[PDB]
Short mmCIF file of C-alpha atoms and ligand atoms in Angstrom, two decimals:
data_model
loop_
_atom_site.label_atom_id
_atom_site.label_comp_id
_atom_site.label_asym_id
_atom_site.label_seq_id
_atom_site.Cartn_x
_atom_site.Cartn_y
_atom_site.Cartn_z
CA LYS A 164 97.09 -202.34 -123.21
CA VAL A 165 96.45 -198.52 -122.89
CA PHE A 166 93.33 -197.41 -121.15
CA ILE A 167 90.99 -194.72 -122.55
CA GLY A 168 87.65 -193.95 -121.44
CA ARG A 169 85.13 -194.76 -118.51
CA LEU A 170 81.92 -195.77 -120.19
CA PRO A 171 78.89 -195.20 -117.93
CA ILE A 172 77.02 -198.58 -117.60
CA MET A 173 73.36 -199.43 -117.54
CA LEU A 174 72.92 -201.50 -114.32
CA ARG A 175 71.37 -205.14 -114.29
CA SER A 176 73.47 -205.71 -117.46
CA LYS A 177 76.55 -207.23 -118.55
CA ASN A 178 78.93 -205.34 -116.85
CA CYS A 179 76.74 -204.64 -113.67
CA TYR A 180 77.75 -206.02 -110.40
CA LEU A 181 74.50 -206.98 -109.86
CA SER A 182 74.09 -209.08 -112.76
CA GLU A 183 75.93 -211.60 -110.48
CA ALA A 184 73.34 -211.11 -107.88
CA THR A 185 70.75 -213.01 -105.70
CA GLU A 186 68.99 -211.99 -102.54
CA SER A 187 72.25 -211.97 -100.36
CA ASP A 188 74.27 -210.07 -102.96
CA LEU A 189 71.43 -207.51 -103.30
CA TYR A 190 71.07 -207.13 -99.48
CA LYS A 191 74.92 -207.09 -98.38
CA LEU A 192 75.49 -204.86 -101.29
CA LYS A 193 72.21 -202.36 -100.42
CA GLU A 194 70.37 -202.83 -103.43
CA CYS A 195 66.51 -202.71 -103.59
CA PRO A 196 65.22 -206.08 -104.49
CA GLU B 33 9.02 -196.52 -63.29
CA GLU B 34 8.35 -192.91 -64.56
CA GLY B 35 10.40 -192.04 -67.60
CA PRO B 36 13.31 -193.82 -69.29
CA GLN B 37 13.10 -197.54 -68.79
CA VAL B 38 15.89 -199.65 -69.33
CA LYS B 39 15.28 -203.42 -70.73
CA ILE B 40 18.70 -204.93 -71.30
CA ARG B 41 19.12 -207.97 -73.51
CA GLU B 42 22.29 -209.79 -74.40
CA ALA B 43 25.20 -208.22 -72.88
CA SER B 44 29.06 -209.22 -72.47
CA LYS B 45 32.11 -207.91 -70.91
CA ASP B 46 32.60 -205.72 -74.08
CA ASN B 47 28.97 -205.54 -75.45
CA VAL B 48 25.93 -203.71 -74.26
CA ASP B 49 22.37 -204.12 -76.05
CA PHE B 50 19.35 -202.58 -74.64
CA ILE B 51 15.77 -201.40 -75.49
CA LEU B 52 15.89 -197.79 -74.06
CA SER B 53 12.30 -197.03 -74.23
CA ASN B 54 10.03 -193.98 -73.39
CA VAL B 55 13.10 -191.50 -73.75
CA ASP B 56 13.17 -188.65 -76.18
CA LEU B 57 14.82 -188.64 -79.62
CA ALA B 58 17.51 -185.79 -79.09
CA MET B 59 17.98 -187.23 -75.48
CA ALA B 60 19.12 -190.42 -77.05
CA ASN B 61 21.21 -188.66 -79.92
CA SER B 62 22.73 -186.32 -77.16
CA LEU B 63 23.64 -189.37 -75.06
CA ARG B 64 25.51 -191.25 -77.80
CA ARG B 65 27.19 -188.07 -78.77
CA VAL B 66 28.62 -187.42 -75.19
CA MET B 67 29.72 -191.02 -74.73
CA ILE B 68 31.47 -190.70 -77.97
CA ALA B 69 33.39 -187.63 -77.28
CA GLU B 70 33.18 -186.41 -73.64
CA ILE B 71 35.02 -188.93 -71.62
CA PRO B 72 38.38 -188.29 -70.10
CA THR B 73 41.23 -190.88 -70.54
CA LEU B 74 44.83 -191.50 -69.79
CA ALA B 75 47.03 -192.23 -72.66
CA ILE B 76 50.60 -191.10 -73.76
CA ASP B 77 51.05 -187.75 -74.84
CA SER B 78 54.70 -186.56 -74.42
CA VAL B 79 57.60 -188.53 -75.87
CA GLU B 80 61.30 -188.06 -75.21
CA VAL B 81 63.53 -190.63 -77.21
CA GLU B 82 67.22 -191.14 -76.15
CA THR B 83 68.41 -193.35 -78.89
CA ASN B 84 67.01 -195.36 -81.90
CA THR B 85 68.36 -197.43 -84.74
CA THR B 86 65.15 -199.34 -85.54
CA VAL B 87 63.47 -199.24 -89.04
CA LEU B 88 60.66 -197.13 -87.93
CA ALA B 89 60.53 -193.40 -87.14
CA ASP B 90 60.79 -191.71 -83.81
CA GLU B 91 57.74 -189.85 -84.56
CA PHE B 92 55.96 -192.95 -86.02
CA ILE B 93 56.68 -195.05 -83.00
CA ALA B 94 55.50 -192.10 -80.74
CA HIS B 95 52.37 -191.92 -82.60
CA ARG B 96 51.84 -195.61 -82.06
CA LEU B 97 52.65 -195.01 -78.37
CA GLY B 98 49.90 -192.53 -78.43
CA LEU B 99 47.52 -194.86 -79.88
CA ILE B 100 48.31 -197.46 -77.03
CA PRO B 101 45.26 -197.43 -74.63
CA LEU B 102 46.10 -197.90 -71.00
CA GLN B 103 44.08 -198.72 -68.11
CA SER B 104 41.65 -195.88 -67.01
CA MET B 105 39.53 -197.11 -64.20
CA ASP B 106 40.55 -194.14 -62.04
CA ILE B 107 40.20 -191.37 -64.17
CA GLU B 108 38.39 -188.98 -61.61
CA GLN B 109 41.50 -188.64 -59.19
CA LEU B 110 43.82 -187.72 -62.03
CA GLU B 111 44.47 -183.89 -62.72
CA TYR B 112 44.87 -182.21 -65.89
CA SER B 113 48.25 -180.86 -66.32
CA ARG B 114 46.94 -177.46 -67.10
CA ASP B 115 44.80 -177.00 -63.95
CA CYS B 116 47.35 -178.80 -61.81
CA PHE B 117 49.49 -175.75 -60.29
CA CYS B 118 52.95 -177.63 -60.43
CA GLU B 119 55.98 -177.34 -62.88
CA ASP B 120 54.54 -178.81 -66.14
CA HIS B 121 53.96 -182.28 -64.57
CA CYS B 122 53.85 -183.93 -61.21
CA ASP B 123 52.60 -187.36 -59.80
CA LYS B 124 48.98 -186.50 -59.71
CA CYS B 125 48.61 -184.86 -63.26
CA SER B 126 50.91 -187.16 -65.18
CA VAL B 127 51.93 -190.81 -65.61
CA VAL B 128 55.59 -191.57 -66.48
CA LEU B 129 56.41 -194.62 -68.44
CA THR B 130 59.94 -195.89 -69.12
CA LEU B 131 60.83 -198.79 -71.86
CA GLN B 132 64.03 -200.11 -72.97
CA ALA B 133 63.80 -203.05 -75.47
CA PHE B 134 66.94 -204.33 -76.66
CA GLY B 135 67.25 -207.28 -79.14
CA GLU B 136 69.88 -210.11 -79.50
CA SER B 137 67.86 -213.33 -80.52
CA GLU B 138 68.66 -213.33 -84.37
CA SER B 139 65.10 -214.00 -85.53
CA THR B 140 62.66 -211.22 -85.62
CA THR B 141 62.83 -209.70 -82.07
CA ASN B 142 59.53 -208.49 -81.27
CA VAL B 143 58.32 -205.72 -78.95
CA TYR B 144 54.39 -205.73 -77.72
CA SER B 145 52.21 -203.78 -75.19
CA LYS B 146 52.92 -205.94 -72.31
CA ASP B 147 56.65 -204.54 -72.36
CA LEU B 148 55.59 -201.39 -70.53
CA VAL B 149 56.38 -200.95 -66.92
CA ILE B 150 54.84 -198.22 -64.88
CA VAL B 151 58.12 -196.74 -63.34
CA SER B 152 56.02 -193.64 -62.01
CA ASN B 153 54.62 -194.23 -58.51
CA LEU B 154 51.05 -194.75 -59.37
CA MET B 155 49.89 -193.82 -55.69
CA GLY B 156 47.91 -197.20 -55.69
CA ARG B 157 45.56 -196.09 -58.56
CA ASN B 158 44.01 -198.39 -61.20
CA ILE B 159 45.63 -196.66 -64.03
CA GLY B 160 48.17 -197.25 -66.63
CA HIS B 161 47.99 -201.02 -67.13
CA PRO B 162 48.45 -202.02 -70.86
CA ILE B 163 45.30 -203.52 -71.85
CA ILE B 164 46.12 -207.04 -72.84
CA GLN B 165 42.90 -208.02 -74.43
CA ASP B 166 44.94 -210.57 -76.05
CA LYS B 167 43.92 -214.28 -76.17
CA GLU B 168 47.30 -215.39 -76.24
CA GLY B 169 48.44 -212.63 -73.93
CA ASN B 170 50.83 -210.44 -75.91
CA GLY B 171 49.19 -206.92 -76.76
CA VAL B 172 49.31 -204.78 -79.63
CA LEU B 173 52.17 -205.46 -82.13
CA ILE B 174 54.64 -202.58 -81.31
CA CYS B 175 57.88 -203.09 -83.11
CA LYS B 176 60.25 -205.52 -84.72
CA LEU B 177 63.85 -205.17 -84.65
CA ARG B 178 67.38 -207.06 -84.63
CA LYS B 179 70.56 -207.30 -82.75
CA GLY B 180 71.82 -203.60 -83.08
CA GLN B 181 68.45 -202.13 -83.02
CA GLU B 182 67.17 -200.74 -79.73
CA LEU B 183 64.03 -199.13 -78.56
CA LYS B 184 64.60 -196.52 -75.75
CA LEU B 185 61.80 -194.27 -74.61
CA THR B 186 60.59 -191.69 -71.92
CA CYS B 187 57.02 -190.96 -72.15
CA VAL B 188 54.42 -189.03 -70.09
CA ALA B 189 50.95 -189.91 -70.31
CA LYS B 190 48.11 -187.49 -69.36
CA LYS B 191 44.24 -187.13 -69.41
CA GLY B 192 41.66 -185.73 -71.94
CA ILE B 193 38.57 -186.71 -73.95
CA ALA B 194 37.86 -187.59 -77.58
CA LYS B 195 37.52 -184.09 -78.87
CA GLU B 196 41.27 -183.09 -78.54
CA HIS B 197 42.35 -185.99 -80.59
CA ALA B 198 41.15 -189.69 -81.35
CA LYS B 199 43.74 -190.82 -79.02
CA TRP B 200 41.43 -190.12 -76.08
CA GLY B 201 38.55 -191.76 -77.46
CA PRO B 202 37.56 -195.04 -75.85
CA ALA B 203 34.13 -195.11 -77.56
CA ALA B 204 34.69 -197.43 -80.39
CA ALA B 205 31.88 -197.38 -82.92
CA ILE B 206 28.73 -196.73 -80.97
CA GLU B 207 25.54 -197.51 -82.82
CA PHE B 208 21.77 -196.20 -82.73
CA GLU B 209 18.68 -197.36 -84.65
CA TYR B 210 14.92 -197.14 -83.74
CA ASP B 211 11.84 -198.11 -85.26
CA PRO B 212 12.58 -200.64 -88.11
CA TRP B 213 8.94 -201.05 -89.45
CA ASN B 214 8.53 -197.56 -90.42
CA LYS B 215 5.18 -196.20 -89.29
CA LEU B 216 6.83 -192.60 -88.90
CA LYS B 217 7.35 -192.34 -92.40
CA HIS B 218 10.64 -190.72 -91.75
CA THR B 219 12.39 -192.75 -94.73
CA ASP B 220 10.91 -194.24 -97.97
CA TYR B 221 13.08 -196.93 -99.41
CA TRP B 222 14.67 -196.59 -102.81
CA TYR B 223 12.69 -199.29 -104.86
CA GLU B 224 12.01 -200.55 -108.35
CA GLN B 225 9.02 -202.80 -107.92
CA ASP B 226 8.50 -203.51 -103.99
CA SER B 227 10.53 -202.10 -101.08
CA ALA B 228 9.33 -205.04 -98.59
CA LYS B 229 10.89 -207.57 -100.88
CA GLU B 230 13.90 -205.53 -102.38
CA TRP B 231 15.04 -203.85 -99.20
CA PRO B 232 15.95 -206.57 -96.70
CA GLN B 233 13.87 -207.50 -93.66
CA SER B 234 15.95 -205.71 -91.11
CA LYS B 235 17.47 -206.86 -87.87
CA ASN B 236 15.68 -205.16 -84.85
CA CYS B 237 12.19 -206.06 -86.38
CA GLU B 238 11.51 -208.91 -83.67
CA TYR B 239 10.49 -206.68 -80.87
CA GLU B 240 8.37 -204.11 -82.47
CA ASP B 241 5.60 -205.70 -84.22
CA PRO B 242 5.08 -205.71 -88.16
CA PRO B 243 3.10 -202.72 -88.85
CA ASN B 244 -0.17 -203.96 -89.57
CA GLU B 245 -0.41 -203.04 -93.31
CA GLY B 246 -4.18 -202.06 -93.57
CA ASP B 247 -4.00 -199.01 -91.28
CA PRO B 248 -4.44 -195.37 -92.10
CA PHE B 249 -1.40 -193.15 -91.41
CA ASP B 250 -0.61 -192.42 -87.81
CA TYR B 251 0.65 -188.75 -87.31
CA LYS B 252 0.99 -188.56 -83.43
CA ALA B 253 3.64 -190.70 -82.25
CA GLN B 254 7.05 -189.56 -81.58
CA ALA B 255 10.49 -191.19 -81.33
CA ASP B 256 10.11 -194.16 -79.06
CA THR B 257 11.67 -197.77 -78.38
CA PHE B 258 15.48 -197.18 -79.20
CA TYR B 259 18.12 -199.97 -79.27
CA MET B 260 21.30 -198.47 -78.83
CA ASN B 261 24.35 -200.85 -79.45
CA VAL B 262 27.43 -199.74 -77.52
CA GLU B 263 31.01 -201.13 -77.30
CA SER B 264 34.42 -200.14 -75.97
CA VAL B 265 38.19 -200.45 -76.26
CA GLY B 266 38.73 -201.84 -72.95
CA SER B 267 40.31 -198.72 -71.17
CA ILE B 268 37.17 -198.82 -68.99
CA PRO B 269 34.62 -201.75 -68.96
CA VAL B 270 31.40 -201.01 -70.97
CA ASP B 271 29.25 -200.32 -68.01
CA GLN B 272 31.40 -197.44 -66.41
CA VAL B 273 31.81 -195.77 -69.94
CA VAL B 274 28.01 -195.08 -69.84
CA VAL B 275 28.23 -194.16 -66.32
CA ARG B 276 30.89 -191.65 -66.85
CA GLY B 277 29.21 -190.33 -69.89
CA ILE B 278 25.85 -189.82 -68.33
CA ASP B 279 28.00 -188.16 -65.31
CA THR B 280 29.53 -185.78 -67.69
CA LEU B 281 26.34 -184.89 -69.23
CA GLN B 282 24.75 -184.29 -66.14
CA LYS B 283 27.78 -182.04 -65.18
CA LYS B 284 27.66 -179.97 -68.13
CA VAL B 285 23.98 -179.33 -67.67
CA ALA B 286 24.76 -178.56 -64.13
CA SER B 287 27.36 -176.02 -65.58
CA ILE B 288 24.39 -174.37 -67.61
CA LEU B 289 22.77 -173.97 -64.18
CA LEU B 290 26.09 -172.78 -62.79
CA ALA B 291 25.98 -170.17 -65.58
CA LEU B 292 22.42 -169.25 -64.89
CA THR B 293 23.37 -168.65 -61.22
CA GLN B 294 26.30 -166.55 -62.55
CA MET B 295 23.55 -164.66 -64.37
CA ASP B 296 20.77 -164.05 -62.18
CA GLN B 297 22.62 -162.61 -59.08
CA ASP B 298 25.02 -160.47 -61.51
CA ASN C 834 30.63 -180.88 -101.19
CA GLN C 835 29.64 -178.40 -103.68
CA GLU C 836 31.71 -178.53 -107.03
CA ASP C 837 33.51 -181.91 -106.24
CA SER C 838 35.31 -181.10 -102.90
CA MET C 839 35.38 -183.71 -100.17
CA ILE C 840 34.75 -183.79 -96.59
CA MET C 841 37.18 -185.55 -93.99
CA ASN C 842 36.63 -187.32 -90.63
CA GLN C 843 39.50 -185.56 -88.82
CA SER C 844 39.46 -188.42 -86.10
CA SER C 845 40.91 -190.94 -88.52
CA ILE C 846 43.54 -188.41 -89.51
CA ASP C 847 44.51 -188.47 -85.84
CA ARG C 848 44.35 -192.29 -86.25
CA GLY C 849 46.96 -192.32 -89.04
CA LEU C 850 45.04 -191.65 -92.23
CA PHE C 851 47.31 -190.30 -94.97
CA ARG C 852 49.99 -189.55 -92.74
CA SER C 853 53.25 -189.24 -94.15
CA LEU C 854 56.93 -188.78 -93.58
CA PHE C 855 59.06 -186.74 -96.24
CA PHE C 856 62.60 -187.12 -97.12
CA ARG C 857 64.70 -184.20 -98.81
CA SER C 858 68.41 -184.24 -98.91
CA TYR C 859 70.85 -181.59 -99.11
CA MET C 860 74.51 -180.94 -100.22
CA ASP C 861 77.40 -178.71 -99.43
CA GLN C 862 81.02 -178.68 -100.91
CA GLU C 863 84.28 -177.42 -99.74
CA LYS C 864 84.83 -176.19 -103.07
CA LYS C 865 88.07 -176.57 -105.46
CA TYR C 866 89.73 -174.01 -107.40
CA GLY C 867 92.31 -174.77 -109.89
CA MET C 868 95.22 -173.94 -107.94
CA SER C 869 94.63 -176.92 -105.46
CA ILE C 870 93.15 -174.78 -102.67
CA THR C 871 90.97 -176.58 -100.53
CA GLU C 872 87.97 -175.09 -98.48
CA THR C 873 86.64 -175.87 -94.88
CA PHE C 874 83.44 -177.16 -93.06
CA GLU C 875 83.81 -175.68 -89.57
CA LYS C 876 81.75 -173.88 -87.12
CA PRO C 877 81.61 -170.08 -88.58
CA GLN C 878 81.27 -166.84 -87.04
CA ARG C 879 81.63 -163.22 -87.99
CA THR C 880 85.46 -163.13 -88.43
CA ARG C 884 77.73 -161.67 -97.84
CA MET C 885 76.95 -162.09 -94.15
CA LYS C 886 73.82 -163.59 -92.42
CA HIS C 887 72.65 -163.26 -88.87
CA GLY C 888 71.56 -166.70 -88.18
CA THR C 889 71.92 -168.35 -84.73
CA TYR C 890 74.50 -170.92 -84.31
CA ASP C 891 72.66 -172.92 -81.84
CA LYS C 892 72.42 -176.27 -83.33
CA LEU C 893 75.99 -176.70 -84.90
CA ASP C 894 78.68 -179.29 -84.29
CA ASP C 895 82.35 -179.20 -83.78
CA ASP C 896 83.03 -178.83 -87.62
CA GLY C 897 79.82 -176.73 -88.44
CA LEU C 898 77.72 -179.77 -89.00
CA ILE C 899 74.15 -180.62 -87.17
CA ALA C 900 73.69 -183.89 -85.42
CA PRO C 901 71.32 -186.26 -87.25
CA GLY C 902 68.82 -186.65 -84.60
CA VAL C 903 67.66 -183.19 -83.51
CA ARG C 904 64.52 -181.18 -84.27
CA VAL C 905 65.33 -178.04 -86.52
CA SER C 906 63.48 -175.05 -86.89
CA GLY C 907 63.21 -171.41 -87.85
CA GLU C 908 66.37 -170.25 -89.69
CA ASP C 909 69.01 -172.57 -88.29
CA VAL C 910 72.32 -172.48 -90.14
CA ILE C 911 72.49 -175.94 -91.86
CA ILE C 912 76.14 -176.60 -92.88
CA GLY C 913 78.98 -174.62 -91.44
CA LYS C 914 81.57 -173.86 -94.04
CA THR C 915 84.62 -171.51 -94.05
CA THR C 916 87.17 -170.60 -96.91
CA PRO C 917 90.02 -167.90 -96.77
CA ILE C 918 91.81 -166.18 -99.67
CA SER C 919 95.63 -165.42 -99.10
CA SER C 933 89.00 -163.45 -94.84
CA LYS C 934 86.60 -165.98 -92.82
CA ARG C 935 83.45 -165.49 -94.82
CA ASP C 936 79.92 -166.49 -93.64
CA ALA C 937 79.79 -169.36 -95.91
CA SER C 938 77.25 -171.28 -93.77
CA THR C 939 73.85 -171.85 -95.62
CA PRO C 940 70.83 -171.01 -93.38
CA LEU C 941 67.68 -173.04 -93.16
CA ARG C 942 64.77 -173.38 -95.84
CA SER C 943 62.28 -170.75 -95.68
CA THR C 944 59.59 -173.07 -97.11
CA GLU C 945 60.01 -176.19 -94.91
CA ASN C 946 60.98 -177.34 -91.39
CA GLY C 947 61.60 -180.53 -89.66
CA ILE C 948 64.26 -182.95 -88.33
CA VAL C 949 67.65 -183.57 -89.49
CA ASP C 950 68.01 -187.29 -89.97
CA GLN C 951 71.22 -188.76 -91.73
CA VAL C 952 74.68 -187.23 -91.99
CA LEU C 953 77.58 -188.84 -94.11
CA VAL C 954 80.90 -187.20 -94.44
CA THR C 955 82.50 -188.45 -97.77
CA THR C 956 84.70 -187.07 -100.56
CA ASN C 957 84.87 -187.18 -104.47
CA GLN C 958 87.39 -188.65 -106.79
CA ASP C 959 89.66 -185.75 -105.96
CA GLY C 960 89.27 -185.21 -102.24
CA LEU C 961 86.59 -182.76 -101.47
CA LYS C 962 85.49 -183.44 -97.94
CA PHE C 963 81.78 -183.71 -98.61
CA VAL C 964 79.01 -183.60 -95.93
CA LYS C 965 75.27 -184.08 -96.64
CA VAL C 966 72.03 -183.87 -94.57
CA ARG C 967 68.74 -185.46 -95.30
CA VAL C 968 65.62 -184.16 -93.43
CA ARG C 969 62.58 -185.81 -92.23
CA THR C 970 59.56 -184.00 -91.85
CA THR C 971 56.11 -185.17 -90.70
CA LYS C 972 53.19 -183.94 -92.70
CA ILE C 973 49.47 -184.33 -91.79
CA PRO C 974 46.64 -184.09 -94.34
CA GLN C 975 45.49 -180.49 -93.77
CA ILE C 976 42.47 -178.97 -95.48
CA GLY C 977 43.99 -176.98 -98.45
CA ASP C 978 45.32 -180.41 -99.73
CA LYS C 979 44.53 -182.06 -103.05
CA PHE C 980 43.34 -185.69 -103.12
CA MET D 1 53.86 -201.69 -92.44
CA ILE D 2 52.46 -202.59 -89.26
CA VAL D 3 48.78 -203.09 -89.07
CA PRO D 4 47.51 -199.81 -87.68
CA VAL D 5 46.51 -199.19 -84.02
CA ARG D 6 42.71 -198.72 -83.82
CA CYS D 7 41.44 -199.39 -87.18
CA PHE D 8 40.45 -195.80 -88.22
CA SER D 9 36.75 -195.65 -88.62
CA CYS D 10 35.96 -197.52 -85.28
CA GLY D 11 39.15 -197.25 -83.55
CA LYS D 12 38.73 -200.67 -82.03
CA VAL D 13 42.36 -202.12 -81.71
CA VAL D 14 43.06 -204.77 -84.34
CA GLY D 15 47.02 -204.65 -84.07
CA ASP D 16 46.69 -207.41 -81.18
CA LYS D 17 44.95 -209.52 -83.96
CA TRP D 18 47.76 -209.84 -86.49
CA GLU D 19 50.20 -212.51 -85.06
CA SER D 20 47.04 -214.57 -83.97
CA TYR D 21 45.89 -214.02 -87.61
CA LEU D 22 49.18 -214.82 -89.25
CA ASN D 23 49.17 -218.10 -87.41
CA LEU D 24 45.62 -218.63 -88.30
CA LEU D 25 46.14 -218.38 -91.80
CA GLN D 26 49.54 -220.11 -91.95
CA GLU D 27 48.19 -222.90 -89.75
CA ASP D 28 44.74 -223.40 -90.88
CA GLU D 29 44.31 -221.54 -94.40
CA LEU D 30 40.60 -221.14 -94.32
CA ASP D 31 38.59 -218.45 -96.15
CA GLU D 32 39.47 -215.08 -94.49
CA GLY D 33 35.93 -214.02 -94.25
CA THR D 34 35.48 -217.03 -91.85
CA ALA D 35 38.87 -216.26 -90.08
CA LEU D 36 38.17 -212.74 -89.41
CA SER D 37 34.62 -213.99 -88.23
CA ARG D 38 36.59 -216.02 -85.94
CA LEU D 39 38.75 -213.09 -84.81
CA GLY D 40 35.38 -211.01 -84.80
CA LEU D 41 35.40 -207.93 -86.76
CA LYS D 42 31.51 -207.89 -87.75
CA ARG D 43 31.50 -204.65 -89.54
CA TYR D 44 33.17 -204.76 -93.00
CA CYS D 45 34.52 -201.27 -92.75
CA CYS D 46 36.83 -202.65 -90.04
CA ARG D 47 37.21 -206.12 -91.71
CA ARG D 48 38.98 -204.16 -94.49
CA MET D 49 42.02 -203.42 -92.17
CA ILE D 50 42.93 -207.17 -91.75
CA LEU D 51 41.80 -208.05 -95.25
CA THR D 52 43.94 -205.46 -96.69
CA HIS D 53 46.87 -204.43 -94.55
CA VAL D 54 50.49 -205.21 -96.23
CA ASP D 55 53.42 -205.71 -94.17
CA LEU D 56 56.64 -204.52 -95.43
CA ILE D 57 58.52 -204.69 -92.19
CA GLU D 58 60.13 -208.10 -93.12
CA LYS D 59 61.47 -206.82 -96.28
CA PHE D 60 62.80 -203.85 -94.21
CA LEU D 61 64.34 -205.99 -91.48
CA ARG D 62 66.13 -208.14 -93.95
CA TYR D 63 69.00 -205.45 -94.43
CA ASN D 64 71.59 -204.69 -91.77
CA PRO D 65 72.49 -203.61 -88.28
CA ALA E 25 77.06 -192.94 -74.59
CA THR E 26 80.41 -192.42 -76.50
CA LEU E 27 79.72 -192.35 -79.99
CA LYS E 28 80.74 -189.88 -82.69
CA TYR E 29 81.10 -191.26 -86.23
CA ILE E 30 79.96 -194.80 -87.16
CA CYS E 31 80.62 -196.34 -90.56
CA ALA E 32 78.25 -199.07 -92.01
CA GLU E 33 80.48 -202.11 -92.12
CA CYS E 34 82.73 -201.23 -89.19
CA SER E 35 80.00 -200.07 -86.80
CA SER E 36 83.00 -198.34 -85.29
CA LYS E 37 82.21 -195.76 -82.23
CA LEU E 38 85.82 -194.55 -82.45
CA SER E 39 85.94 -190.81 -83.04
CA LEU E 40 86.62 -187.97 -85.62
CA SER E 41 87.97 -184.62 -85.73
CA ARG E 42 88.93 -182.28 -88.72
CA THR E 43 90.62 -184.03 -91.47
CA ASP E 44 91.63 -187.20 -89.80
CA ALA E 45 91.04 -189.66 -92.44
CA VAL E 46 88.29 -189.77 -95.01
CA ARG E 47 88.76 -193.54 -95.14
CA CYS E 48 87.74 -195.61 -91.94
CA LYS E 49 89.77 -198.34 -90.41
CA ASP E 50 89.23 -202.32 -90.49
CA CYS E 51 87.26 -201.77 -94.00
CA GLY E 52 88.73 -199.42 -96.81
CA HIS E 53 85.28 -197.85 -97.52
CA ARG E 54 85.10 -194.17 -96.79
CA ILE E 55 81.54 -192.95 -96.13
CA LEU E 56 81.74 -191.97 -92.41
CA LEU E 57 78.15 -191.45 -91.22
CA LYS E 58 77.92 -189.61 -87.93
CA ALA E 59 76.73 -190.95 -84.82
CA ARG E 60 73.20 -189.88 -83.28
CA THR E 61 72.22 -187.45 -80.60
CA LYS E 62 73.72 -187.52 -76.97
CA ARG E 63 70.98 -185.32 -75.52
CA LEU E 64 67.21 -185.90 -75.69
CA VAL E 65 64.83 -183.91 -77.70
CA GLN E 66 61.08 -184.41 -76.89
CA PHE E 67 58.11 -184.81 -79.24
CA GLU E 68 54.34 -184.65 -79.06
CA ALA E 69 52.39 -187.66 -80.05
CA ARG E 70 49.67 -185.87 -82.20
ZN1 ZN F 1001 51.99 -182.13 -62.23
ZN1 ZN F 1002 38.11 -199.70 -87.25
ZN1 ZN F 1003 81.94 -199.79 -92.51
#
């Protein structure tokens, strides 16, 4: 409803983009495997 | 004959092995040192890159380029670019190489030795051929790239010996070992109980006899019967490197005599 | 090799032993005041003042990412007036020298035209180095 | 990386041997002491280069144009 | 060799001058990497 706060997320976790990831995701998104 | 007799055993295109008998110790040592260090050789020195998007560095790739050995049969008629009185390089002191390798095949586009084309006018000299010693005829593994990547060079190769660098050394691991059955007492082996059983019965023990255990100790004998195993890269064959090495050693001792004639007249 | 020091074949160092690249990156900012005033990255001149040579600059005070850099080159051209043109470029590093490698021209959440420089520099294992 | 040109001690080139040795392992899978004996590095201080060397070039070239 | 500013996804040898667009076209990302050298700089293989 009303947006407050932008909490910094630890990566490879359950709001990280790269928790959805395999090799194509890592390489196309420039992430070290 | 008179002095140094040569008795060549097993040899190859790129292997020499020889009893070099009735020669002096420091003579053998000086010979292996000058054949290591003191022979001129063409290899790539100056590198001008136009564009590059490969995964390797320009400087790294240029360092490999320098480590590429070329053909150096005709070293004697190529000038140093310092003693040549031209403007920094010419076609008698320098060898220009030009290489553009582009990739579009979408599975590990490769680049090897045999891609080098000598665009410089070689004046009909046996120089600059990239030494395909390969069984399958490819060369050294130079570079790997894909579609958008590219390898664009403009290189100049020059002379020099194995003391400027290691890039002008065609010598490649020259051996020297005399007198296995040690009657000279130059070395007592480390041992717990028995050196003859603990220390292994060595390689060149076939030719000189086992040292006849029950004898008193000889003192008179010097260093004789050397068995010097040599090798090469392949920039020159293995006879011509011993030729050019003894030639340059003879030339430097002639330079000692040149300095003596410089001295005793002035 | 008295007191643990070790002795080195220089020929293998020519052959590649412990050869290494080195990657430092820089920053530069067209700064932001409180009164919405933007700054500029462009090729500076005399119009805190340095005397570094402008010889490797770009159109907008940058340096092209594939050229050998040396001495005391001006790294990122930057200008800013107040309502003059200052010497807001930053000169080279007194302690290192090498090759500029990679330049991206980006911004932040609030629009500061942000350009960067990474430097590549070869380094060979010299005598006074610790192993 | 790439196997180094002129394996540092001797300086005999071995960067020719890498693709043939690659297909020698992938094709025949022997003990590598015998495999390098077939590709002929008699001294162990140069056998170390092919027994050791790690390529990272393929994991580099997976990325992007 | 006409190449000035090349983004990652759109490898786009287009242009750029002072304050044109921080976003590149054909893809909304805005990194704007600059292209390599026109001229040639020479190095030693030592
Ligand atoms: Zn010349
Ligand atoms: Zn070696
Ligand atoms: Zn893009």
